[PDB]
Design a protein around this ligand. Structure first.
Ligand SMILES: Nc1ncnc2c1ncn2[C@@H]1O[C@H](COP(=O)(O)OP(=O)(O)O)[C@@H](O)[C@H]1O
Ligand SMILES: Nc1ncnc2c1ncn2[C@@H]1O[C@H](COP(=O)(O)OP(=O)(O)O)[C@@H](O)[C@H]1O
Ligand SMILES: [Mg+2]
Ligand SMILES: [Mg+2]
Lengths: 7, 372, 72, 372, 7, 7
């Protein structure tokens, strides 16, 4: 992703 | 007519083929391999990077990257190689001829669709495009108009309630448990028995142990006692090199983390309580039809006994006058593609495509306008 | 072998093996069925190309004249 | 085209010839003899020192030095005489005309290549040069792209795993058991039967007893019992002077030290356990292809029965579902030269040469830059 | 270990 | 060699 998780 | 392509990028597998076919022409892992060692021979025909069944075949030499994780594309230069391989080598068709249909998990980043669109029109020059929510397609596949859909592949799981073709966006649940996190858990737990797996090329071994050996217990704590007391449950598997491993009470512990994400340290509830809470967010006139039409979809739902375990543990939550049915067709690993194959063949759909003439005027943001 | 007047055992040996030799030593080495088929077909192509050049040399012998050719 | 020279310095033998030939023009021992007695006659045409087949012919008058030991060149003024003899007397070709290719055991000292390069450009004035790992060339010779190679000459033994032309440097094993240490063992053991050999000119006799009489037992302790109980195994050899010697259970004890280096007081494991451990250092996806393509190479692997003994004692270590094949072609003593002969003939290779214009810019250290 | 490595 | 063995 961009914040919460790593993707 | 030029038939449209259906290309279910998913994660971990690419499924592609022509609309109106009943199963995809191309099913290969969405994996890009680059060689890490020094090449020593000369004239070998060295090749920069390998896609799919090649990277699986040569995997011992390679580092394997998945460009999509949790349904988000994280490396576009890999992903575009995967599409290039899909159109030109695997389907052997020029995508400039006829439209293309693509599938995405709900509620993921807005920019992912814009990039997919920009790549499809700019580089691949597709005449028209659309993107469709996977869980909607699973209903087209299972032949229904009213459903709640537990769609769970590699990367991502989500519930979408649909009543008579009206989706209920406020009730859409998304969860990031998936086959890849069952695999990484199976790696961290097999170590208990001394076996060890540290590289991607053997992450791909654990991924196939999970597929053959694992199964879901109808009730967890009694089978945990059983297989702690009698060894009769344990089964053995030959690794590629010829070593035999043996797996016992473990082989039901990894798929059961779908029902207890605490095992990998997530807060959230399992697939059963997220399914029930998604039904509870729906208004009360439709709950009986949602309880009847629970549809399993995607590969992570393939474990033996996941149907009966779901029906049990939702019946433990539902009001006892209701009736609970879990619809788990054997094709279900492909149902998102089958649904997109029928969707793309409908004559009514032909208006829906985003044509290049529209994109050239509005830019890639047109997706948010004309898609869901 | 009956046609060409050769020992069956020599053809049967040499079709399936090949001989390496250094000045001091020589080795008879077996070869794959693929290499055996490539060798047989190369021998057939060589017999043909030589037969062709021979027929063309007899043509030339029938067409030549003894006078010294000044130009052509 | 100008064909390149291929000159496999090895140790103990020099093998040299032109690229594209199928066997070397020149095979002579890499040995330099100097006369030790007082020369008494006058006008004889005495000559300071002899190279190769001369020093073998006159050996009774000479002291014989090998300039290479354990694949390391230890005397450069000998070695340069050997190269001078190779180019000018034996091949009868000026090396200034066309490129030269040289072979080296892996993992040996870095300065050996720098000195070889410096001598080849400065004195012999070769237009271009390359140095190539012997065990890589043995695959070119045996017609394979995936292999593990037990290459064992005089001086040095090594295993190199290669998968589809990617070498796995972390798994390269090198061992200093060799034909010369089997020879020095055969000298120290023949003393049991009273025969004695103390000088280099008769070390060269023991070196040929070892070649003709010795063989490897399929199982050691039963043949040791047999030939201690029945004399039927013993064979006899005529020394140069006409004395007959007789050798019994001994003639299998010296080559069997390849499998038990304890006999000469080394710690390390034999060639079989180093082969298996080299496979074990490789990643598990490739081990089945390594187990199938075991390639014997170099002269010390010529002993009768070493193939069957290897296949036995590796099958004793490998997982029993695997299949183990030892590839021992009869040419194998020359396979490193044959492989270098084909390598140097590849049109793709012509870029690879270290040209003098590069060396004059980068200095002799360019080898580490442009070679393997 | 029992599989993935020598221990 | 230079240390361990004699070459
Ligand atoms: N028969 C099976 N049983 C259990 N797990 C499976 C099975 N087939 C695939 N999987 C796992 O599920 C994931 C693949 O699901 P899939 O539906 O192909 O993903 P997507 O459709 O999102 O590309 C992988 O993690 C894989 O290991
Ligand atoms: N036919 C044979 N049988 C057994 N030992 C041999 C044979 N030929 C050579 N040797 C021994 O092996 C060594 C020569 O191996 P070789 O492969 O010629 O060395 P290199 O290739 O490094 O020059 C010598 O010690 C020699 O005594
Ligand atoms: Mg899926
Ligand atoms: Mg050698």
């Amino acid at each position: 992703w961009x914040a919460x998780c790593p993707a | 007519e030029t038939t449209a392509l259906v290309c279910d990028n998913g994660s971990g597998l690419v499924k592609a083929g022509f609309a109106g076919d009943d199963a995809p022409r191309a099913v290969f892992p969405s994996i890009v391999g680059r060689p890490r060692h020094q090449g020593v021979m000369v004239g070998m025909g060295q090749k920069d990077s390998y896609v799919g069944d090649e990277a699986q075949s040569k995997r011992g030499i390679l580092t394997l990257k998945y460009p999509i994780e949790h349904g988000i594309i994280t490396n576009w230069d890999d992903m575009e190689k995967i599409w290039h391989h899909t159109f030109y080598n695997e389907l052997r068709v020029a995508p400039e001829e006829h439209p293309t249909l693509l599938t995405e998990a709900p509620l993921n980043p807005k920019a992912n669709r814009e990039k997919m669109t920009q790549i499809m029109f700019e580089t691949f020059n597709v005449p028209a495009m659309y993107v469709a929510i996977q869980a909607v397609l699973s209903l087209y596949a299972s032949g229904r108009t009213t459903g709640i859909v537990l769609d769970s592949g590699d990367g991502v799981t989500h519930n979408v309630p649909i009543y008579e073709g009206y989706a209920l966006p406020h009730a859409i649940m998304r969860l990031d448990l998936a086959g890849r996190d069952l695999t990484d858990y199976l790696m961290k737990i097999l170590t208990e028995r001394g076996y060890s797996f540290v590289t991607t090329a053997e992450r791909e071994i654990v991924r196939d142990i999970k597929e053959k050996l694992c199964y879901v217990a109808l009730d967890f704590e009694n089978e945990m006692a059983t297989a702690a007391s009698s060894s009769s449950l344990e089964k053995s598997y030959e690794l590629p090199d010829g070593q035999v491993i043996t797996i016992g009470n473990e082989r039901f512990r990894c798929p059961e983390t779908l029902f207890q994400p605490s095992f990998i340290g997530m807060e959230s509830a399992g697939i059963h309580e997220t399914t029930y809470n998604s039904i509870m967010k729906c208004d009360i006139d439709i709950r009986k039809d949602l309880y009847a039409n629970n549809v399993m979809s995607g590969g992570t739902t393939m474990y033996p006994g996941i149907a009966d375990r779901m029906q049990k543990e939702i019946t433990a939550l539902a009001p006892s006058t209701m009736k609970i049915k879990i619809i788990a067709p054997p094709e279900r690993k492909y149902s998102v593609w089958i649904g997109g194959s029928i969707l793309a063949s409908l004559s009514t759909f032909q208006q829906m495509w985003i044509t290049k003439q529209e994109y050239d005027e509005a830019g890639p943001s047109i997706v948010h306008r004309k898609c869901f | 072998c009956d046609l060409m007047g050769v020992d069956y055992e020599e053809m049967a040996h040499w079709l399936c093996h090949r001989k390496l030799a250094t000045a001091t030593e020589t080795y008879i080495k077996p070869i794959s069925k693929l290499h055996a088929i490539n060798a047989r077909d190369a021998l057939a192509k060589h017999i043909y190309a030589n037969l062709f050049n021979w027929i063309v040399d007899h043509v030339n012998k029938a067409l030549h004249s003894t006078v010294k050719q000044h130009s052509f």
